[PDB]
Motif scaffolding. Structure first.
Motif, PDB file in Angstrom:
ATOM      1  N   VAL C   1      34.688  49.602  37.908  1.00 58.52           N
ATOM      2  CA  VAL C   1      35.188  48.556  36.970  1.00 58.52           C
ATOM      3  C   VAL C   1      34.357  48.522  35.693  1.00 58.52           C
ATOM      4  CG1 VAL C   1      34.938  47.262  39.123  1.00 58.52           C
ATOM      5  CG2 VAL C   1      34.065  46.266  36.997  1.00 58.52           C
ATOM      6  N   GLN C   2      33.045  48.696  35.821  1.00 57.38           N
ATOM      7  CA  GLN C   2      32.213  48.629  34.633  1.00 57.38           C
ATOM      8  C   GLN C   2      31.530  49.892  34.146  1.00 57.38           C
ATOM      9  OE1 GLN C   2      32.640  47.533  32.221  1.00 57.38           O
ATOM     10  NE2 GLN C   2      31.639  45.553  31.852  1.00 57.38           N
ATOM     11  N   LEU C   3      31.502  50.009  32.824  1.00 58.78           N
ATOM     12  CA  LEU C   3      30.885  51.122  32.127  1.00 58.78           C
ATOM     13  C   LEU C   3      29.762  50.555  31.268  1.00 58.78           C
ATOM     14  CD1 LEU C   3      34.003  53.054  30.760  1.00 58.78           C
ATOM     15  CD2 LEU C   3      32.784  53.447  32.888  1.00 58.78           C
ATOM     16  N   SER C   4      28.796  51.400  30.931  1.00 56.05           N
ATOM     17  CA  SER C   4      27.668  51.001  30.103  1.00 56.05           C
ATOM     18  C   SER C   4      28.115  50.705  28.674  1.00 56.05           C
ATOM     19  CB  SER C   4      26.611  52.111  30.093  1.00 56.05           C
ATOM     20  OG  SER C   4      25.675  51.928  29.046  1.00 56.05           O
ATOM     21  N   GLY C   5      27.208  50.134  27.891  1.00 59.60           N
ATOM     22  CA  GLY C   5      27.514  49.809  26.512  1.00 59.60           C
ATOM     23  C   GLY C   5      28.018  51.010  25.734  1.00 59.60           C
ATOM     24  N   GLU C   6      27.187  52.043  25.605  1.00 59.79           N
ATOM     25  CA  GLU C   6      27.597  53.231  24.869  1.00 59.79           C
ATOM     26  C   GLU C   6      28.464  54.178  25.694  1.00 59.79           C
ATOM     27  OE1 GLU C   6      24.729  51.506  23.553  1.00 59.79           O
ATOM     28  OE2 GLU C   6      23.330  53.148  23.143  1.00 59.79           O
ATOM     29  N   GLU C   7      28.836  53.761  26.902  1.00 61.95           N
ATOM     30  CA  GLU C   7      29.712  54.583  27.732  1.00 61.95           C
ATOM     31  C   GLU C   7      31.110  54.345  27.177  1.00 61.95           C
ATOM     32  OE1 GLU C   7      28.850  53.732  32.092  1.00 61.95           O
ATOM     33  OE2 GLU C   7      29.542  55.805  32.216  1.00 61.95           O
ATOM     34  N   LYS C   8      31.498  53.074  27.103  1.00 58.27           N
ATOM     35  CA  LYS C   8      32.804  52.702  26.569  1.00 58.27           C
ATOM     36  C   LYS C   8      32.998  53.314  25.188  1.00 58.27           C
ATOM     37  CE  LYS C   8      33.660  48.231  28.856  1.00 58.27           C
ATOM     38  NZ  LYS C   8      33.802  46.758  28.649  1.00 58.27           N
ATOM     39  N   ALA C   9      31.960  53.244  24.362  1.00 56.88           N
ATOM     40  CA  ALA C   9      32.019  53.790  23.008  1.00 56.88           C
ATOM     41  C   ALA C   9      32.350  55.285  22.981  1.00 56.88           C
ATOM     42  CB  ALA C   9      30.691  53.534  22.284  1.00 56.88           C
ATOM     43  N   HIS C  69      50.331  56.434  27.953  1.00 55.28           N
ATOM     44  CA  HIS C  69      50.219  55.151  27.277  1.00 55.28           C
ATOM     45  C   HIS C  69      49.550  54.150  28.228  1.00 55.28           C
ATOM     46  CE1 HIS C  69      50.822  52.464  24.094  1.00 55.28           C
ATOM     47  NE2 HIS C  69      52.112  52.621  23.866  1.00 55.28           N
ATOM     48  N   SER C  70      49.915  54.219  29.508  1.00 53.79           N
ATOM     49  CA  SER C  70      49.360  53.326  30.518  1.00 53.79           C
ATOM     50  C   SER C  70      47.872  53.531  30.731  1.00 53.79           C
ATOM     51  CB  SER C  70      50.092  53.488  31.849  1.00 53.79           C
ATOM     52  OG  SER C  70      51.310  52.772  31.837  1.00 53.79           O
ATOM     53  N   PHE C  71      47.428  54.779  30.822  1.00 59.76           N
ATOM     54  CA  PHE C  71      46.004  55.016  30.996  1.00 59.76           C
ATOM     55  C   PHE C  71      45.296  54.380  29.809  1.00 59.76           C
ATOM     56  CE2 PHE C  71      47.061  58.180  34.181  1.00 59.76           C
ATOM     57  CZ  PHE C  71      45.963  58.124  35.036  1.00 59.76           C
ATOM     58  N   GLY C  72      45.904  54.496  28.631  1.00 60.18           N
ATOM     59  CA  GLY C  72      45.323  53.915  27.435  1.00 60.18           C
ATOM     60  C   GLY C  72      45.066  52.436  27.646  1.00 60.18           C
ATOM     61  N   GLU C  73      46.113  51.705  28.023  1.00 58.17           N
ATOM     62  CA  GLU C  73      46.000  50.275  28.281  1.00 58.17           C
ATOM     63  C   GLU C  73      44.989  50.058  29.404  1.00 58.17           C
ATOM     64  OE1 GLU C  73      47.832  47.533  26.669  1.00 58.17           O
ATOM     65  OE2 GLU C  73      47.913  49.221  25.266  1.00 58.17           O
ATOM     66  N   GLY C  74      44.605  51.153  30.052  1.00 62.67           N
ATOM     67  CA  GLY C  74      43.630  51.084  31.122  1.00 62.67           C
ATOM     68  C   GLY C  74      42.246  51.259  30.527  1.00 62.67           C
ATOM     69  N   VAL C  75      42.117  52.222  29.619  1.00 63.37           N
ATOM     70  CA  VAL C  75      40.855  52.510  28.947  1.00 63.37           C
ATOM     71  C   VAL C  75      40.437  51.358  28.027  1.00 63.37           C
ATOM     72  CG1 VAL C  75      39.655  54.088  27.381  1.00 63.37           C
ATOM     73  CG2 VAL C  75      41.323  54.979  28.996  1.00 63.37           C
ATOM     74  N   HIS C  76      41.394  50.506  27.670  1.00 60.19           N
ATOM     75  CA  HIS C  76      41.118  49.377  26.783  1.00 60.19           C
ATOM     76  C   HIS C  76      41.009  48.025  27.489  1.00 60.19           C
ATOM     77  CE1 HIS C  76      42.982  52.192  23.663  1.00 60.19           C
ATOM     78  NE2 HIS C  76      41.730  52.018  23.281  1.00 60.19           N
ATOM     79  N   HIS C  77      41.417  47.967  28.753  1.00 59.90           N
ATOM     80  CA  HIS C  77      41.349  46.722  29.509  1.00 59.90           C
ATOM     81  C   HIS C  77      40.585  46.916  30.814  1.00 59.90           C
ATOM     82  CE1 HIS C  77      43.967  44.749  26.692  1.00 59.90           C
ATOM     83  NE2 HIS C  77      44.982  45.560  26.938  1.00 59.90           N
ATOM     84  N   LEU C  78      39.477  47.646  30.731  1.00 55.59           N
ATOM     85  CA  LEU C  78      38.612  47.949  31.875  1.00 55.59           C
ATOM     86  C   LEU C  78      38.186  46.736  32.704  1.00 55.59           C
ATOM     87  CD1 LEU C  78      38.521  50.822  30.774  1.00 55.59           C
ATOM     88  CD2 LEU C  78      36.059  50.562  30.471  1.00 55.59           C
ATOM     89  N   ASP C  79      37.785  45.674  32.014  1.00 55.66           N
ATOM     90  CA  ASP C  79      37.317  44.446  32.651  1.00 55.66           C
ATOM     91  C   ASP C  79      38.419  43.606  33.299  1.00 55.66           C
ATOM     92  OD1 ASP C  79      35.532  45.450  30.519  1.00 55.66           O
ATOM     93  OD2 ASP C  79      34.255  43.747  31.056  1.00 55.66           O
ATOM     94  N   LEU C  81      41.615  45.233  34.912  1.00 55.62           N
ATOM     95  CA  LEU C  81      42.572  46.256  35.314  1.00 55.62           C
ATOM     96  C   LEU C  81      43.627  45.749  36.290  1.00 55.62           C
ATOM     97  CD1 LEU C  81      41.732  48.534  33.665  1.00 55.62           C
ATOM     98  CD2 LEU C  81      40.555  49.551  35.628  1.00 55.62           C
ATOM     99  N   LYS C  82      43.194  45.051  37.335  1.00 61.31           N
ATOM    100  CA  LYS C  82      44.122  44.542  38.338  1.00 61.31           C
ATOM    101  C   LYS C  82      45.196  43.628  37.752  1.00 61.31           C
ATOM    102  CE  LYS C  82      41.612  42.734  41.614  1.00 61.31           C
ATOM    103  NZ  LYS C  82      40.412  42.389  40.792  1.00 61.31           N
ATOM    104  N   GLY C  83      45.009  43.211  36.503  1.00 54.22           N
ATOM    105  CA  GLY C  83      45.988  42.355  35.859  1.00 54.22           C
ATOM    106  C   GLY C  83      46.915  43.165  34.973  1.00 54.22           C
ATOM    107  N   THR C  84      46.358  44.174  34.310  1.00 52.99           N
ATOM    108  CA  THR C  84      47.122  45.036  33.414  1.00 52.99           C
ATOM    109  C   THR C  84      48.054  46.003  34.152  1.00 52.99           C
ATOM    110  OG1 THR C  84      45.359  44.944  31.756  1.00 52.99           O
ATOM    111  CG2 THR C  84      46.955  46.753  31.569  1.00 52.99           C
ATOM    112  N   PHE C  85      47.785  46.235  35.435  1.00 54.68           N
ATOM    113  CA  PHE C  85      48.608  47.145  36.229  1.00 54.68           C
ATOM    114  C   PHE C  85      49.333  46.452  37.375  1.00 54.68           C
ATOM    115  CE2 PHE C  85      47.625  51.363  34.597  1.00 54.68           C
ATOM    116  CZ  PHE C  85      46.486  51.120  33.840  1.00 54.68           C
ATOM    117  N   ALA C  86      49.265  45.126  37.415  1.00 52.97           N
ATOM    118  CA  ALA C  86      49.913  44.365  38.480  1.00 52.97           C
ATOM    119  C   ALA C  86      51.410  44.669  38.600  1.00 52.97           C
ATOM    120  CB  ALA C  86      49.694  42.869  38.253  1.00 52.97           C
ATOM    121  N   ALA C  87      52.080  44.795  37.459  1.00 56.12           N
ATOM    122  CA  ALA C  87      53.510  45.079  37.435  1.00 56.12           C
ATOM    123  C   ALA C  87      53.801  46.491  37.928  1.00 56.12           C
ATOM    124  CB  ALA C  87      54.055  44.896  36.019  1.00 56.12           C
ATOM    125  N   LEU C  88      53.164  47.479  37.301  1.00 53.93           N
ATOM    126  CA  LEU C  88      53.354  48.879  37.676  1.00 53.93           C
ATOM    127  C   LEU C  88      53.031  49.116  39.146  1.00 53.93           C
ATOM    128  CD1 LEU C  88      51.956  50.974  34.682  1.00 53.93           C
ATOM    129  CD2 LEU C  88      54.324  50.682  35.397  1.00 53.93           C
TER     130      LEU C  88
END
Ligand code: HEM
Ligand code: HEM
Ligand code: HEM
Ligand code: HEM
Lengths: 141, 146, 146, 141
Positions: C1-9, C69-79, C81-88
């Motif tokens: 679920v979590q990445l480091s500060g400069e990891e996300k970057a 496109h979905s992975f994208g919404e995944g790479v941007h909503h890391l914190d 995820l279980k909410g951004t993919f609940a529908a799919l």
């Protein structure tokens, strides 16, 4: 994958199954359909009702197929070639489902042959089912 | 992570009859024998070369009892699986580095041992309910991982 | 679920260079060719007989763009995820009955495709960060499992 | 499992790899330790540092072992028996780890041979790594 000790264990284990291979195959299928409903997706054209005759007939097929394989442990790829073509290219069964059926077959064997289903037998039978599963999921035309 | 009201009733009623010592010791023993790489985590217990030594090992029996007792906590807290296994999830994932697939393997061995002990009474419908419990327990233990 | 500060970057920095058209399509294409049982869910897309027909299929390329496109919404909503993919999740799990293990395979194929386009710039340290993202996305999609 | 077409693809693809097998094996390892920390468990005595000479030296071993396997596609069980005894009987490596290394190896190949790593070669190379993995995780004697 299969050592000599495993082949020995399997042959001996199937000898105790005897003529009940079809019954066990049928029960294993019933256990698989209820325990993992996802597997029902592959049998749309089936009457999966309690005690269904279709499941019973198919169980027999699966059971004979397994007895066939026990007789050709040193060449499963060739003895089960037609079956591989059917499951891998035509049906396109997700290999995951094979683990499900194998687990339900071992569960069924544990229920009917409690005194014979020993740790060693369990271990060899598991490798056996895994070997058969790999052959039926591989597209090696 | 849940079952019908009539499923829980059936699951718990069977648990009243489970001997954690006999079932636990057999389950852990069959895990080590059927999936040998799992022996790697219990070298401190001793000789695990053959099934004879494994099933007769006291450490295996004692630890198996502990494991089965944990499943018991699960069975009595099906609605709070994640919370019930948080501590064990940390231990198995962050400390021991046990791959999650093994949580699923022990779950099935356990079901196979239950089938052997209860015979025709462990009906396919009963097993189906236990496949949910075992699935839930494995998922909760893998939480602290991901 | 979590990445480091400069990891996300470093992760986002690479994603900004991803071609939205190509990548997704090649990823779905490779999944269908390497793991043929997945073709079972895409018969309506037409001919998937040989690698030539798959990579050149229009449906595959288009649908891949969606997936990417979905992975994208995944790479941007890391914190979350279980909410951004609940529908799919409800779709793939409850409607299509896709086995979770496949979510993992596609995630990994996507990583191999990313490795092919970026070469030595897709460092082992960067792939490590993407393996976390891939793991997170696979888990969120499996969450709603019944 | 490994069809005739796969065999040709594998031999052809490994020739493009050539003398870089050792290098690739070392990079694949590095990608594995970082991407899946759980694998560092089997190398407690190793300098898993960035640019380690131990990792480089080991990658070489893995690399030559695969080159040896490509030359014995028709008899992997015999040709890799000493490595099967090592990984299965002595080290008792969890098979899940082999899938991780395989994935990391393919990623490495996609990095250095993007034009040769076509979908067809990707598929054969994946079946090839699975067969090798099965042989090293099995206890068959
Ligand atoms: C290793 C275990 C398995 C064996 C030995 C096996 C054996 C067989 C046999 C012998 C047949 C065809 C019999 C005939 O020609 O009438 C068959 C058909 C089939 N199998 Fe399997 N099978 C196995 C696992 C699976 C799994 C896990 C699935 C999927 C859940 C599956 C799905 C099917 C289907 C859908 C058919 C066609 C049924 C029909 O239309 O009549 N099989 N199998
Ligand atoms: C659903 C599965 C599992 C459950 C519920 C379970 C439960 C437990 C419990 C209750 C403990 C006791 C810890 C304590 O005394 O504080 C424990 C310890 C441990 N578990 Fe598991 N476990 C599971 C799977 C595994 C697997 C598959 C492995 C490895 C292959 C494993 C390896 C260990 C080890 C090495 C310890 C430490 C043993 C000791 O020194 O006491 N466990 N587990
Ligand atoms: C991380 C993995 C995956 C992601 C992010 C993902 C994402 C998506 C998205 C966004 C859609 C579009 C739904 C819509 O338009 O409303 C979709 C549909 C679908 N997905 Fe996936 N998917 C994944 C894996 C898979 C896998 C592994 C399979 C099958 C093996 C699969 C089969 C399908 C199918 C059949 C549809 C419906 C296609 C249609 O009728 O247009 N997906 N997926
Ligand atoms: C298909 C890939 C693999 C191949 C072909 C392979 C090959 C080898 C070879 C050639 C050796 C012996 C070298 C020597 O004699 O010094 C070896 C050692 C070793 N391998 Fe593997 N290996 C593979 C996968 C794995 C995996 C997945 C792990 C676990 C993460 C693993 C862990 C080890 C360990 C710990 C040693 C001994 C290292 C030492 O103490 O120096 N191997 N392997």
């Amino acid at each position: 994958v299969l050592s000599a000790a495993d082949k020995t264990n399997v042959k001996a284990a199937w000898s105790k199954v005897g003529g009940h291979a079809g019954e066990y195959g049928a029960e294993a299928l019933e256990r698989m359909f209820l325990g993992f409903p996802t597997t029902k997706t592959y049998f749309p054209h089936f009457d999966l009702s309690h005690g269904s005759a279709q499941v019973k007939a198919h169980g027999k097929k699966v059971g004979d197929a397994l007895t066939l394989a026990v007789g050709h442990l040193d060449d499963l790829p060739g003895a089960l070639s037609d079956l591989s073509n059917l499951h891998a290219h035509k049906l396109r069964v997700d290999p995951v489902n094979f683990k499900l059926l194998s687990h339900c077959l071992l569960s069924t064997l544990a229920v009917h042959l409690p005194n014979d289903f020993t740790p060693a037998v369990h271990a060899s039978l598991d490798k056996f089912l895994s070997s058969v599963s790999t052959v039926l999921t591989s597209k090696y035309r | 992570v849940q079952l019908s009201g009539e499923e829980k009733a059936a699951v718990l009623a069977l648990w009243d009859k489970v001997n954690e010592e006999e079932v636990g010791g057999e389950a852990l023993g069959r895990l080590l024998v059927v999936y040998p790489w799992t022996q790697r985590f219990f070298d401190s217990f001793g000789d695990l070369s053959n099934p004879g030594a494994v099933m007769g090992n006291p450490k295996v029996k004692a630890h198996g009892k502990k494991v089965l007792h944990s499943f018991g906590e699960g069975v009595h807290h099906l609605d709070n699986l994640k919370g019930t296994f948080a501590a064990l999830s940390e231990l198995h994932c962050d400390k021991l580095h046990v791959d999650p697939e093994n949580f699923r393997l022990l779950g099935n061995v356990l079901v196979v041992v239950l089938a052997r002990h209860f015979g025709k009474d462990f009906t396919p419908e009963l097993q189906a309910s236990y496949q949910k419990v075992v699935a839930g327990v494995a998922n909760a233990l893998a939480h602290k991982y991901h």
